[PDB]
Design a binder for this molecule. Sequence first.
Ligand SMILES: NC(=O)C1=CN([C@@H]2O[C@H](COP(=O)(O)OP(=O)(O)OC[C@H]3O[C@@H](n4cnc5c(N)ncnc54)[C@H](O)[C@@H]3O)[C@@H](O)[C@H]2O)C=CC1
Ligand SMILES: NC(=O)C1=CN([C@@H]2O[C@H](COP(=O)(O)OP(=O)(O)OC[C@H]3O[C@@H](n4cnc5c(N)ncnc54)[C@H](O)[C@@H]3O)[C@@H](O)[C@H]2O)C=CC1
Ligand SMILES: NC(=O)C1=CN([C@@H]2O[C@H](COP(=O)(O)OP(=O)(O)OC[C@H]3O[C@@H](n4cnc5c(N)ncnc54)[C@H](O)[C@@H]3O)[C@@H](O)[C@H]2O)C=CC1
Lengths: 512, 525, 512
Amino acid sequence: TSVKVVTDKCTYKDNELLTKYSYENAVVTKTASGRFDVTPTVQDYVFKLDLKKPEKLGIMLIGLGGNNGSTLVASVLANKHNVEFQTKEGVKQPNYFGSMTQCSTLKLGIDAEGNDVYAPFNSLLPMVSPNDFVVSGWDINNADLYEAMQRSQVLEYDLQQRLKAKMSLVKPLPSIYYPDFIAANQDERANNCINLDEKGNVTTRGKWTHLQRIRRDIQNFKEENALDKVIVLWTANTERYVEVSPGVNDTMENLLQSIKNDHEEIAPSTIFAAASILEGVPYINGSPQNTFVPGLVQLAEHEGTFIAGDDLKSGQTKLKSVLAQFLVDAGIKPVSIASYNHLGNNDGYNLSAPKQFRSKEIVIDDIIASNDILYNDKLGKKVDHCIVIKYMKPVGDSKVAMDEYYSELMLGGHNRISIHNVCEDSLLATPLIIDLLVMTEFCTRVSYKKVKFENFYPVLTFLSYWLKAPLTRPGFHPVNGLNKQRTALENFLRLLIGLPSQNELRFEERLL
Amino acid sequence: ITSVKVVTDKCTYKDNELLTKYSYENAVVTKTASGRFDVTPTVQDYVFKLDLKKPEKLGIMLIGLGGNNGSTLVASVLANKHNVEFQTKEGVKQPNYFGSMTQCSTLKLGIDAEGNDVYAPFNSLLPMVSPNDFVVSGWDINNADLYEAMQRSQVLEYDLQQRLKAKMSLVKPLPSIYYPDFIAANQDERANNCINLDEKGNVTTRGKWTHLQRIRRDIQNFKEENALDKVIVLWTANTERYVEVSPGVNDTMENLLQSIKNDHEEIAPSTIFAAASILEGVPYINGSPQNTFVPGLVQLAEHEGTFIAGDDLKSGQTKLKSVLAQFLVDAGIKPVSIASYNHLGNNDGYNLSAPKQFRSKEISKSSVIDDIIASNDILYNDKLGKKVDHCIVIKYMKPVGDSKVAMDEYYSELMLGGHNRISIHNVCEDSLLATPLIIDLLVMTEFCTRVSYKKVDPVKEDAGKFENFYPVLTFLSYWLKAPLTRPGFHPVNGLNKQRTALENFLRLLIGLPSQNELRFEERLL
Amino acid sequence: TSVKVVTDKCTYKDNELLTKYSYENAVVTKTASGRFDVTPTVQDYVFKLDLKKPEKLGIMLIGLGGNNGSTLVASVLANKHNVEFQTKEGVKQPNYFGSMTQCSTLKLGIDAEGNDVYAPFNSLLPMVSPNDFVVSGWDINNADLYEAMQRSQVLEYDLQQRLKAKMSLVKPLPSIYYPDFIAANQDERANNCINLDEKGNVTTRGKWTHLQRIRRDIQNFKEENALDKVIVLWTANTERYVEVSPGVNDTMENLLQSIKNDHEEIAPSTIFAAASILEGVPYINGSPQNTFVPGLVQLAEHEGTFIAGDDLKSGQTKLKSVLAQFLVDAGIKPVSIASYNHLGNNDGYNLSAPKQFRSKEIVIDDIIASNDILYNDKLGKKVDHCIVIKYMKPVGDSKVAMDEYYSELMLGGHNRISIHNVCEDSLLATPLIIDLLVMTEFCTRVSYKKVKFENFYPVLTFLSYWLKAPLTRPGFHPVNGLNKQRTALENFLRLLIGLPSQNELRFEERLL
Ligand SMILES: NC(=O)C1=CN([C@@H]2O[C@H](COP(=O)(O)OP(=O)(O)OC[C@H]3O[C@@H](n4cnc5c(N)ncnc54)[C@H](O)[C@@H]3O)[C@@H](O)[C@H]2O)C=CC1
Ligand SMILES: NC(=O)C1=CN([C@@H]2O[C@H](COP(=O)(O)OP(=O)(O)OC[C@H]3O[C@@H](n4cnc5c(N)ncnc54)[C@H](O)[C@@H]3O)[C@@H](O)[C@H]2O)C=CC1
Ligand SMILES: NC(=O)C1=CN([C@@H]2O[C@H](COP(=O)(O)OP(=O)(O)OC[C@H]3O[C@@H](n4cnc5c(N)ncnc54)[C@H](O)[C@@H]3O)[C@@H](O)[C@H]2O)C=CC1
């Protein structure tokens, strides 16, 4: 399955694609009298896409032994080796359901009858398959991924047994454990640490040698498997936000300096990031903690390395943001929105401590911002909202989410909508992780020039669709509208092969 | 093993039998035309006799042995009896009988030396048969062995089915009676294990008396092949369509029996199994909503003096509904609407997908609230209205397997124009709930067959002689959706009251008064 | 409507009822081998019921201007004067729906066809009607009850307007305001206080003169309306628990002493209680705070005054306790139970502060205690449970409660039940308040003697049905089983008129 567009905007040379693209947009200024003055703008670009993709992509997950880590590895092996498994519904064939890059489609255009024609998401331009992922990584616990699977209780027992022989071979590398940064109850789980002093004890001293050991782990992984490309992704327990203070982590020199000075504002994630950046490998932060402090972002630009992150956009927040937008697009005013989530995994176990959850408890202000017709000082520009996460160990990885929306309708009416969501959290997070790795790898092969080619700006915004707290560029505010986060990705892929943005005008039908 | 020894002078033991005196109190009421209630207390002493020697093995014959419930029942018995632990994603699980009131619930025996309540197993008071001692068999219009049945049902954990594979593979259903018009047309291709075949081996609704005699011999054969003394038969097969009751047809014992002989078209397979069990003196329990117990049949039960009971297993949805509607009315709240929707993807919801099958169901799943309304004329009367909109919907959605999804919306009125909206959403493997319920019914039925009594004349020692429970075992209503009643008496669906009756019954047999919840040891100095 | 029982257990003399009652029960002792030895016990009693009930009952509500207070007053006037009102569903007739004493029935026995015969709950023995309630009380805010109704937004606007003329006449008396005891945000609401110093400022000094002013308010109310009987009920913002320390509030002398010593462990509720006790008027605590400290209980016994309380059993906790018990009675093991409630009234506004909510966040251990078959060390004698209350002002008094039960079924199965409850909290609390006042008044006319008559033991346990945290007697643990809390009341009324406890045996049907 492949796509071939006949357009003069695209030319190939040496397994390299050059595409011309005129980007339009507009600048608006609301005059005093409330009049909107709009001046269209246009910037011409040329994109270069290295068509040669890695035959094998290296993946190093921090928190490799967790729910997401073990499920990620199981999914790759299960599909790669077509491991069909037994269930009470009979034999099931492995697949990557839940993955946008592997299981969603896009509209390329219309056929001769005037009907939409769809194509696989990853069929327009070359993308690496999760089947060619080589996975390794770190974890403060040394259990092999088979034991990690058993511990997670995420996958069908029979599938676990069919992957037992292969998963047992995979074992996480020791990692960096700074106790003060996570939930204290994660203290006896840590039996796999590199940061130990002469008395064989865990220390936060020698942070630079810790950073150097991570770089070594990455180099070794690459060499040991003969891989050219590697991507690192954090999927470990949420850390407590670090304080961004001047002189400490505001510049890449201070940051690198603080790391050598064993500063207390340097968290483990801070070191895995600085270590990946220095090795030139893309780094994805899948947790809410503010790993990407200023200093770290500088070091990323300077090295021209791709970073991205801030939480693995839960499937509830994802969907909850969609409905909310749906209502406001319909002229309906949600005046209240209550969210209640409870899970029984370690993830929920680590969020128990308010320090870990406070990072998570961090989109509604954007929707309410989009509509001043319903939200203003005369009517009430406010929306009550609450986010409660509770740890109910008996529900395991199978989380339960509930959202209640109370909105006002016309003439005193009201509307109450309740969303009850139940599913194994990891079966939604894993595929998200796959999509992130696939698209990060894809973007590293893309360069642009306004009209010498520059890298596709380190902070990969197209990846906001899969991250609850979209990282941003100084000054610009993030946009969480999920449909728009996928519309961005979709149009980007389209513009790379000479196709315009979707307009949905269907003039072949609407007009004579 | 846990046991209970009540030091009372109301109980005496004689040759494997417990004799218990009990003074039953009640009161008759009349309401003066004007509006007063004249209440006359009543009393009637009894001496109950409980046969303590319970059967070492109890025969169980299920009609629908290869269905979701029959399948799971045998599996639960085998798994528990042999302690067949199994693997799941939550690890190794030990078998158990959760969901079984008889096996996993407790009863308060009293208070301790310090005033704190003391409970004991429901089955620890008096000798009851353990489901682990069930010797199960039965009939089914389909010949799949019970392992295939398990596979097809998709109720139990794959690993468990596998560990039960060898044993369950050897369990094969006896051929049954298939009368095409009594069930959904889709079960058509499923019937390949019938006894009613004509010269050229085709399905035939002719020779129904021969069929009755075959079923009876089946019961006899089963019994002797297992060296069993006791046997209970329980219908857990497809839901049949209601059969019309007509004078001279099935209105009397004699009429019914002849009709069976005449191959009357109002004689359903269940009618024959019911009649056969009754003639064999085997307790028969109807676990489906169809009106199997027509007058003539009940009459035959009464004449033969054989236990019958039933009409639909009290689903976890209709159970919880009775508990919640009762609760609201007991609190003075007025339900004015109760919407109950639900969908399943098993053969149960597939056979119910037909309007005539769903009809039986919709009759039993509804009536469960008629008595609730009748008890409160303060709320329900001619002024305020005494109606309660109640609709029941059962949709078939194959993709959900045995897992049923029940949703109930209660809209009630509160004071001064206010309203209350309660929504109950229920998800579970419907069959993991029904199975222990089937176990409860069989354990209690068996227990009852060992109970006899006699009225005691206060002014004349040892009058009369011991009798058995009136044939219709209303004591089993706790587990049935549409409680079968005695002519004249209305059914009571109050779940909590249904269990209380059972509780107090067991309590009295060991000389304990009914629970009063007065707790004067603390409420009074 | 009335009931007349023909029994020799009952004799009337001078509008006085004497009833004989043999109370049976049993003492159990589980021998080492796990054998239960049971010895039945029996105690004979004679109850005296003063058949002469007050023609008018005085009611003084602390927090008279709140949601419950104003709705209580509106309900009495609406029904008493048959104020029919307009709604979009048409004209509605006032009623006391939700009240057990006014709208529930009981089974007296069976008729001649063998069918149950029911009678009104308050038709067996004389009970005072809420229509003969004379209501007054205190509140830190001085708004009249008409303004209080508008503020509560609990009742149909049209009904509010039809009661406007009468409700405006009712105004709350100034009350005792000790800032440190409630949610700080209740600081500008307090414009009606008696505890003011010479500089006209609010003080916590002079607590004894405060107590004396309450007694005066009660005496005046009684005299001013020519009432013999009065009952006081607390329905004000939840207070923060006070610390029970020896020498301060462990005895009635220390307590009375501490009150004079302006001790910080003496809360406003503590004073309204001690003041009602001294005036010999029954005192009901409708909030979770521990008002009834030791000392206060002594003073109650010594004066032989009836007290009772500890939260107005929310309709959710009520029902949530019923389902939970239903499951455990069925042999089903709830292994997890999550509760999430959010409201927009002042009540929820006051619970915002963890100090107020902590009192509320205080039954599952009893159910789990009843069944060691499912709950033991081999299986797991634990049930995860959580209680979350959030303040969502837009939902107003119309609270939303959600309970999720996750239970284990046989052979690895599970059952998940979700209960979504929506209603105006006050429309459920008001009638509960009515039932409490009616039954407290009823019990004050009941005396007993084992076989000189003693008062129906101060701590009225029969009232646990309407109180989330049933107050108790030293040593005895409370029982919250709602059906059993109503079975107690029901049988008590029955035993007073010579009828035995319900057995549900129906031998007229089951036996030949
Ligand atoms: N649970 C889920 O399915 C989803 C999780 N997320 C996010 O992804 C993160 C991981 O979630 P899960 O895999 O489920 O949780 P988990 O708790 O099972 O896995 C985290 C793993 O991180 C390891 N770990 C902790 N600190 C470490 C360190 N300093 N170095 C290396 N390893 C370390 C732990 O030992 C554990 O095995 C969460 O913090 C959350 O932000 C978002 C959506 C869904
Ligand atoms: N499955 C559940 O959770 C509950 C079931 N029930 C009732 O219990 C009954 C059985 O339910 P399931 O086991 O789930 O259904 P099922 O459809 O899986 O099993 C019924 C079995 O009966 C057999 N059968 C049908 N007509 C027969 C006849 N004349 N003679 C012998 N066998 C016959 C069928 O071939 C099938 O194997 C139904 O009537 C249903 O309404 C009620 C409450 C819950
Ligand atoms: N909101 C409801 O409908 C129900 C309330 N409850 C309970 O009843 C209590 C009252 O609830 P609502 O009437 O709804 O709340 P509310 O906040 O509307 O009414 C409480 C009233 O107490 C007054 N107040 C506070 N401290 C006082 C003091 N020291 N002296 C005199 N007045 C004082 C306040 O000014 C307010 O008017 C709650 O604390 C809660 O424990 C329980 C179930 C339902």
